[PDB]
Every structure is written in structure tokens, then in C-alpha cells.
Amino acid sequence: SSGNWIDVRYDLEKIESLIQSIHIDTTLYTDSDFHPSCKVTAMNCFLLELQVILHEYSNMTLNETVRNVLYLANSTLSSNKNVAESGCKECEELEEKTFTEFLQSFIRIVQMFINTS
């Protein structure tokens, strides 16, 4: 599983580089206070919010890369799937952050998954 999460994080890192030359005015639900208790719920919110980027930007490489993240992340959560969580917040009650801060936290949670993979 960690191998799959490694590819996911490398893509997120690529996106960081990519948007250095792309104007981004999108704000997204960001859970920087994610915890193991609700780690799958939090990951799913990050994954869901990416679709927003796909809708708002036509940049080819950016699109292919975020889509590449979804394919792999969903596959992994699907394949190596575990329990069901409770007492977790809905995505819509998280604060909205700039895409850059959203990505930084996204990278941090994927790192958590890699560390406990």
C-alpha cells in the first residue's frame, strides 16, 4: 500500500511545481487537523475536492496529473480497504484554504498513510 501512496504523493508534489506557473483562484475544504480515527474520511474529502480543480482548469498536464492521483488513490482505498469510521465531520464543515495550503495538507495526510502503510 505504501508504494501506491508514494506514487500519489509524488504526483501531488508534481502539482505543486505545475501550479507555480498557473494562476489558481480556487479555495477548497482542507482538513489539516486530520487524525487516524477519521483518516479515511479526511482522505476522501481531499480526493473529492480535486474534482473541483478538474472542473475549473483546462491545463492539460494539470488535469492528467490530478486525474492520475484520483485513479490510484481510489484504487488503493478500494483495494486495501478497512473498517468504517464514525464521529467524523462532513467535508463541508472544514475550513476552505488556498489550493497551495490544501495541497500541503494533502501531502501531509498521504505521508501519514505511507508511514502507517
Partner: protein
Amino acid sequence: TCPPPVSIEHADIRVKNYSVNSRERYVCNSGFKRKAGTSTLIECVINKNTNVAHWTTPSLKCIRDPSL
């Protein structure tokens, strides 16, 4: 220029610029939240073939604020 935008349920929009390449955003009404995965954005894009501009189709969905 682009025509008036469509109305989205539980949302409002105040278009500042109707010109091509303009990017505007709907704002969900108080008590409602932009559903995760949906976008508040619409952009005025031109059909070079006919010189007619139109707003991109919004995917926005405003749902009841879960925190209420």
C-alpha cells in the same frame, strides 16, 4: 459578451465582468454550503466559430450547512 448566468438553487451571483475570459463565482446563501466536489465557478468563453460567448456550465450544488 456573455448573457446573464443561470440561477442556481440556494445561491446568488453578482457578475462583475461579462466579457470573454471573465471568471465569476456563485455564492451559496447563508445557511448553505458549497457541496464538496462541486464548483462555484463559471467562465465566459467564446465560440470563435460564431462569435457568440456563453458561460461554462456550473457544477455547483449548495446544500444545508451540516454545522446547523
